[PDB]
Design an enzyme around this catalytic site. Structure first.
Site: not given
Ligand code: M6G
Ligand code: M6G
Length: 498
Positions: A143, A94
């Site tokens: 979520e 997820g």
């Molecule tokens: C967790 C989370 C949010 O997903 C992130 C992602 C959305 C990032 O947001 C982030 O880091 N926020 C910090 C705050 C955390 C607090 C919120 N925690 C939670 N909601 N849940 C939790 O804690 N669960 C245990 C964002 C900055 C990003 O890089 O998106 C990129 C595009 C810029 C992306 C969408 O392409 C992304 O690329 C990579 C870097 C490869 O990461 C991929 C995803 C495909 C993951 C699937 C998404 C993943 C993990 O980076």
């Protein structure tokens, strides 16, 4: 006596899997080898993230994943168990991106829990993946399931639990049995989607990992701490949505449980879980962030706390102004709104104009940049003392964090957590938990211990009167009452004997 759980997320992108290497930071910043034996001993769980649910309604790796490099990465994590016979390598299905209401895989989550046959297929897939890659357990990070889907979710977990218990028996794993957890809501708006059924949701779990962070962000009007332990009366307060949950309770019962507005804090989420009957404190794990959230546009006077701001909420970040001064990772990641703790140490150490400040009500630190109008909420090893103490006093299962990659190079945050739980020479008995606002709610699962005179038949009790009867201390809701406590609507169960 029971060791507190310490649950750290390990996240790694598909391209980094597909180019995995332990010898070039620029391709993989946080390879498994960065998890030393010392770090491994300090962890009880690692949550490898993220897998997903595909359109086949099964648990799946990203279809772009090289299977061989993935097994290899996973094998390197399982090899860590050689240093720590308690350590489990879970995997998570997820996350926000896959599973939020508008997330790319969202319908798969909904459809996989929808029918008995869907659940049987889904549950099977989860344990098939666990077994096939050598994982120790399953963590679901949806979520979030929404009221119609909640029943299905509950049944899906029940079905995974049974299958995990079969597997534990098949592999003679009673010394380290296969486990099931979820990442749970850490604030009431999302929590309310499944609050009424919280006992059923927790019952099949080893732990529910509360996401008690990101409680503030660029989507808010007003800057605030993202993971305040307790409330500051100067900060914003929010509507308590839990009081509109389908609980079947009376007005007084709702009012005593769900003060509104209330401070959105770690302590609130925790108590909101404890107010529910059949939710045991030992299963509740406090989530903490290893990352700060930054805001710009803050016009200060109070350290940039509780100020209006100009931080964009849109994803992806909508321009190339990387305004978080000194944050080199923000540049690499094209987003100045999130900085790892590792990064925040360097920002604060360098000549960049930040002051580290401390809010003695919330017991949390924050950065303020007076010249540019910046504010950063984050957690450090000082705020972890208060949180670890809270975890001990309230008899929680432990601590979870997102994520390992964001600790500093020496792993000081993880070390601090391990120390506050396990070091013989660490003493927090004099640590002042402060006068910040506690969440007062009382519900059926967390009645305080009380005394009062026995109920007496024939006596006329005025409003506010407290008696004891058949186990409990009751309180008249109005006067004048002669009925036996519990037999009509006039008496409120307010405490327990003994
Ligand atoms: C967790 C989370 C949010 O997903 C992130 C992602 C959305 C990032 O947001 C982030 O880091 N926020 C910090 C705050 C955390 C607090 C919120 N925690 C939670 N909601 N849940 C939790 O804690 N669960 C245990 C964002 C900055 C990003 O890089 O998106 C990129 C595009 C810029 C992306 C969408 O392409 C992304 O690329 C990579 C870097 C490869 O990461 C991929 C995803 C495909 C993951 C699937 C998404 C993943 C993990 O980076
Ligand atoms: C508003 C607004 C614009 O976007 C909103 C969205 C951004 C919300 O902003 C909002 O209401 N702003 C007005 C001022 C806060 C006052 C109350 N404050 C709170 N309720 N605070 C609180 O709960 N703190 C943790 C925000 C609270 C949110 O839930 O963000 C989540 C992440 C935690 C989200 C970005 O994932 C969001 O989740 C849901 C709820 C599923 O909704 C998605 C979107 C994916 C929409 C696309 C965004 C849409 C409409 O909810």
């Amino acid at each position: 006596s029971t060791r507190k759980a310490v649950i750290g997320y390990y996240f790694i992108p598909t391209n980094q899997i597909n180019n995995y290497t332990e010898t070039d930071t620029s391709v993989v910043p946080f390879p498994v080898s960065n998890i030393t034996p010392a770090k491994a001993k300090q962890l009880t769980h690692i949550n490898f993230s993220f897998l997903d649910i595909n359109s086949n309604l099964e648990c799946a790796w990203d279809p772009a994943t090289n299977d061989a490099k993935a097994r290899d990465v996973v094998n390197r994590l399982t090899a860590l168990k050689a240093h720590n016979p308690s350590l489990r390598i879970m995997f998570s299905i997820g996350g926000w991106y896959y599973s939020n209401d508008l997330g790319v895989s969202h319908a798969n989550y909904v459809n996989a829990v929808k029918t008995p046959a869907a659940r049987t297929k889904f549950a099977q897939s989860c344990v098939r993946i666990m077994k096939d890659y050598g994982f120790d357990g399953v963590d679901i990070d949806w979520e979030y399931p929404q009221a119609a889907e909640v029943d299905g979710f509950i049944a899906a977990l029940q079905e995974i639990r049974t299958l995990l218990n079969q597997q534990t028996i098949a592999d003679g794993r009673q010394a380290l049995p296969y486990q099931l957890t979820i990442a749970g809501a850490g604030g009431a708006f999302f929590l309310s989607r499944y609050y009424s059924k919280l006992a059923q949701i927790v019952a099949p779990l080893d732990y529910i990992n509360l996401m008690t962070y990101d409680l503030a962000g660029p989507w808010e009007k007003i800057t605030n701490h993202q993971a305040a332990l307790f409330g500051d009366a100067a900060g914003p307060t929010f509507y308590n949505a839990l009081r509109e949950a389908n609980l079947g309770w009376s007005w007084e019962e709702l009012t005593r449980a769900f003060p509104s507005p209330f401070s959105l804090t770690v302590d609130a989420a925790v108590q909101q879980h404890l107010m529910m009957e059949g939710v045991p404190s030992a299963k509740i794990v406090m989530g903490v962030p290893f990352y700060g959230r930054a805001f710009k546009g803050v016009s200060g006077g109070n350290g940039g706390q509780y100020s209006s701001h100009s931080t964009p909420g849109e994803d992806p970040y909508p321009n190339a102004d990387y305004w978080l001064v000194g944050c080199d990772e923000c540049v690499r990641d094209k987003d100045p709104r999130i900085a790892s703790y590792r990064q925040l140490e360097q920002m604060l150490q360098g000549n960049y104009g930040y002051q580290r400040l401390w809010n003695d009500k919330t017991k949390t630190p924050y950065l303020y940049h007076a010249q540019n109008g910046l504010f950063v909420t984050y957690d450090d090893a000082e705020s972890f003392k208060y949180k670890a103490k809270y975890i001990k006093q309230q008899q929680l299962g432990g601590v979870m964090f997102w994520h390992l990659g964001q600790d500093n190079r020496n792993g000081d945050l993880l070390a601090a957590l391990d120390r506050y739980f396990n070091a013989a020479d660490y003493d927090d008995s004099q640590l002042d938990m402060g006068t910040g606002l506690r969440y007062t709610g009382v519900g059926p699962g967390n009645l305080p211990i009380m005394t009062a005179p026995a109920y007496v038949p024939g006596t006329t009790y005025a409003q506010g009167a407290l008696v004891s009867y058949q186990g409990y201390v009751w309180q008249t809701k109005w006067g004048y009452i002669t009925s036996a406590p519990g037999s009509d609507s006039a008496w409120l169960k307010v405490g327990r004997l003994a």
